[PDB]
Amino acid sequence: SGKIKISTPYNLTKRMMMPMLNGFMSQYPEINIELTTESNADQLDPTEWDVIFRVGPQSSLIARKIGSVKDILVASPEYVNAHPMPTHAEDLHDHFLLKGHPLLKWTLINSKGETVVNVDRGRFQANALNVVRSACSEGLGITLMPDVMIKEYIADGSLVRILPDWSANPRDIYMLYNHLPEKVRLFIDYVIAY
Amino acid sequence: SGKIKISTPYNLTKRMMMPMLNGFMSQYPEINIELTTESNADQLDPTEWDVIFRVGPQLIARKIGSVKDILVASPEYVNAHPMPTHAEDLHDHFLLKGHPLLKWTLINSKGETVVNVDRGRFQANALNVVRSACSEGLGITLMPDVMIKEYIADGSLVRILPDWSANPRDIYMLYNHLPEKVRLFIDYVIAY
């Protein structure tokens, strides 16, 4: 009762959650927040958390869509100017690939509906996407990255979208909960009105 | 030239290990790296890794750096409260704590220890989100100085209680008693 216990998706927490959480704590200094970045919330016990933030639908919980994310393929211009870029999703077998959990398996769908799966062993493989982006920035190959994690790179041009007819299918980010304590109710109200 | 499987500390991988790993991969494009950021090196069986990067001492060890956790706050927060002159005044301030620094064992230049285990305003299992809340002026945090070299350089984060700190600990590269690709990596890391 002395805190709010929340769970957020692993790679996406800092970009899509922290501005909201900072603005809430700023407005409510009396409220304490306990945050746990989670790699997969499918094995979560909802009776142990006040609010759960999750990628993709999940039970008898109040679900609220608050955003979506689409994974795109990117590479640095240095890499693009040093290799012939793939014209089809199958050409990625002949390229340096950088893969990060949970996107070790690339399921890519194009504009006319064809699905192409890549299970190649990456030249760099990590259980976190922020270091994969770091390796993609120094021109080490192509990666599949959530667009929200590389928004400023795409706008600036330090990363370039490659194979632009392809992407993983978008997923929605939900906020779940469930007599409700006041501080938890105030937080849910804050998120809805963000 | 094959696959290398390495383990690095959770919070320190991006700003401390990646420049070196990125340089190694660019130099040996036929060597692949499997990287696992781990929050507890004392949870690993050494025979399952080629190289393990670890904080503090642990079968072959080699020091490659050191780190000390420091207490910092944004200037916005400093300007809005009287900053603590003694380590026990931290009980009067908003605290932001991140794993594995939930328990603050702070020590001064004379070896005296002050422990802080107050509930923070914000608590998390990752320091990168705790730094974000500190930069917004939401309180004082204990943070590895290597993680915030950029903000201390221009005063975006201010060091408070300068005589106090966590106990400085060293960063070790470990390996077993050897493939050609692994020795190249080990030699590259020492020369960095």
Fill in the DSSP letter of residue B16. I
Helix (H) or strand (E) holding B67, with range, is strand B60-67
Q: Considering only the C-alpha atoms of chain B, give the largest distance between any 2 of them, rounded to a whole number of Å.
A: 58
- Give the three-class secondary structure for A137: helix
Full domain range(s) for residue A81: 1-194
User: What six digits make up the tokens of B50?
Assistant: 């080629």
DSSP assignment of B124-178 equals: ES-HHHHHHHHHTTS-EEEEEGGGGHHHHHHTSSEE-STT-EEPPEEEEEEE---
Q: What is the C-alpha separation between B115 and A122, in angstroms, rounded?
A: 44
| Cβ contact B25–A127 (<8 Å) | no
C-alpha A75/C-alpha A97 separation (Å) is: 10
Cβ–Cβ contacts within 10 Å for residue B167, how many? 12
Please identify which residue in the block is written with the tokens 């991006």.
B14
CB contact under 8 A, B124 and A26: no
Task: Return the residues preceding each gap in chain B, C–N over 2.5 A, or none.
Answer: 58, 177
User: Which residues in A have their CB inside 8 Å of a CB on B?
Assistant: 2-3, 13-14, 18, 21-22, 25-26, 29, 32-37, 96, 121-128, 130-131, 134-135, 138-140
The CA distances from residue A86 to A109, A130, B145, in Å, are 15, 24, 42
| CATH code (residue B104) | 3.40.190.290
- Determine, for residues A130 and B14 on separate chains, whether the beta-carbon distance falls below 8 Å: yes
Q: How far is CA B80 from CA A22, A52, B83, B139, in A?
A: 17, 33, 9, 10
Tokens found for residue B114: 């002050």
Counting the structural domains of chain B, the total is 1
Q: Please, what is the end-to-end C-alpha distance for chain B in angstroms?
A: 21
Which chain B residues are closer than 8 Å to A136 by Cβ?
none
* Residue at A189: amino acid letter: D
State how beta strands A160-161 and B122-124 pair: unpaired
Q: What is the distance between the alpha carbons of residues A21 and A1, in angstroms, rounded to a whole number?
A: 18
How many other C-beta atoms lie within 10 A of the C-beta of residue A46?
17
Q: Which of A160, A170, A169, A167 is nearest to A89 (CA)?
A: A167
| B119 contacts A2? CB cut-off 8 A | yes
